[PDB]
Each structure stands twice: as C-alpha cells, then as structure tokens.
Write an enzyme that holds these catalytic residues in place. Sequence first.
Site, PDB file in Angstrom:
ATOM      1  N   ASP A 260      -9.904  -0.177   6.198  1.00 57.87           N
ATOM      2  CA  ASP A 260      -9.078   0.954   5.865  1.00 57.87           C
ATOM      3  C   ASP A 260      -7.849   1.196   6.320  1.00 57.87           C
ATOM      4  O   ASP A 260      -7.700   1.744   7.527  1.00 57.87           O
ATOM      5  CB  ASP A 260     -10.085   2.024   5.814  1.00 57.87           C
TER       6      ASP A 260
ATOM      7  N   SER B   7       8.940   3.270  -2.170  1.00 58.20           N
ATOM      8  CA  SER B   7       9.286   2.406  -3.345  1.00 58.20           C
ATOM      9  C   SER B   7      10.433   2.835  -3.955  1.00 58.20           C
ATOM     10  O   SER B   7      10.818   3.955  -4.016  1.00 58.20           O
ATOM     11  CB  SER B   7       7.917   2.384  -4.464  1.00 58.20           C
TER      12      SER B   7
END
Length: 330
Positions: A35, A199
Amino acid sequence: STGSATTTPIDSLDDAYITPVQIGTPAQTLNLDFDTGSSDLWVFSSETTASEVDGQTIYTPSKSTTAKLLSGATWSISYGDGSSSSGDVYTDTVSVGGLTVTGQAVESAKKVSSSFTEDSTIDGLLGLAFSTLNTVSPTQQKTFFDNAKASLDSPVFTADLGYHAPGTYNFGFIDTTAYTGSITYTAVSTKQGFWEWTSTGYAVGSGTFKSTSIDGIADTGTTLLYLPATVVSAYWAQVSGAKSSSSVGGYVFPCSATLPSFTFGVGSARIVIPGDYIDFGPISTGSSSCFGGIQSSAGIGINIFGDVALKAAFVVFNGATTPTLGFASK
C-alpha cells in the site's frame, strides 16, 4: 541488494493485490496488500480477537526465535474506506522476494474492523508511503522500504500491476524489459506523507487532450481512480445510460456498454487506460447495472491514482534524496 516478488489480484475484478511476505524465523509467509498510500506493516496474528479472524493466515510471534516485543508500543490506524485496526508491536526479520530487513516493526493486530475480517485473502498490509505517516506510539517506526533503502543497489521500488493477471513489485532496480518507450519522471511532494504528484491533463477515448493540472497520490492500496467531479462527468458523459447513483455510492453504467479509454498526462507523456480496465462489474450479483472504475474525489479531499490508473503503467517510486515518480507505458 535487490528483491522481486509477484503480486496477484485477490479476485476477478482486481479489487486489490496480494504479495507474499516472509516474517520471522522460521519463516511465516503471509499475503500482504502492498500500500503506497500508508506506512504501517500490520498483520493478523495470534493476538487478534478470535471472532475477528475468518480464514486469514496469522503471524504467531511466540513461534519466531527472532521476534522481540517492542515494549510499550501500540498502533492504531484508520483508512480512507472507513476500515481500521490496532494492536501492539514486535520487531522481527521480514523478507520480500529475496530482500531481507532485520529489526522491522511488525504491527500485530489485537482488533480489526469488519471489512478486514470479511476478506479472507488479505493477511495484513505493508505500507510503502513515507514513514512520517507511521502510527506506532510512542516511538514512530520506519517502513520496510525505508529500512531497506541504504542496502539497495538503487533507492527505488517499482510497481507493475497486471490487468486481470499477476504483476511484479521490484526493490532496488529498474527492469528495462518491463516497459515500452522511456520512463517520464515527475516531481513529488512529501508534505502529506504520500507519493503526491501533478498530472498534466486528460483525454476521454479518442478525444482531444485537455491540459490541466491534477494534484493526486499514487496509491496501490486504493482500487479505483478518484478524480475531480468535472473530469469524471466528462468521462461518463461518453457512456450511454451512465449516471451517478447516490444509493449505490457512485457512477454506474449499463453492463452492456463498451467503455472508452481514459488518458492521463505525465509531463509531455501520456498513459492510456483501456476502457475494459474501468469495468468493475455488477453492483450486486445478477444486476445489469455495473460499477464504474473512475469515480469522483469530491469529499475525499484528495485525488487518488489508484490501481485502475497504476496498472496501465510501469511505475517507479524513486526514493532518492529528492523523491520523484516515473511512469512508462507497457
């Protein structure tokens, strides 16, 4: 040193991925959910309330000759999905795919919440975010990657998740045969303890690319792709019959649909998520309403590049002095 381990979907939907981890002496092998969105290595154990164990493999520290109770230490964690766990702490030897750390903090669950109990395939979590998020008190503990880093050939790990198929976590090296083209690296902020990056935009299907900054986290421990409501609406508008359902808890779509791809930007480069990756199947057994793999982050407080996004790429988690993230097509 290096390590390499195969990671395997827990079910036919890729709801999560498990990777085998050796703990203790003699080895006790548990299947953990790696994780990159948390920083605790915790396990189902011989100390876990008996009624809260239902099929998981347990760590028994009394059977490990290298286990030592970390005196006075406790832990308690809550995850974005509402689940939680807590307990005490041992140090022990932990190996992943041939890479060994001695004196790793292994957090032993005394209590787990229902969703953990109900998932027999996940024996615990191995956190790979920054150690600043580790919950052990009164002395915070380091992640497996943090403990291994100095010994690695290169201070990196890579995630290569498969679509409906196994993939690989590598530690200490970049497998140049595992991706196509070049790796595009992008800046990371560690201020919130996550692999947080920006992004450069998105496209829906064969549509034109929209240049826009989207701040989010690369999180292998989250199943879906959670993005701003504007982006998510633009995607689902291209699917006939798709709608946001308050009763279901997100966007659903007719199971008869063919989904368009979703592209996200990494610098000037582009990662394409095929439409099939965005299908998470019937909302309930036998239903013709299917659950979408792109959902709104509104009310989470952060955008999450979870498995839906990450599995379309070869992803480098670069733990150099200034951390960065790398993405390649594959």
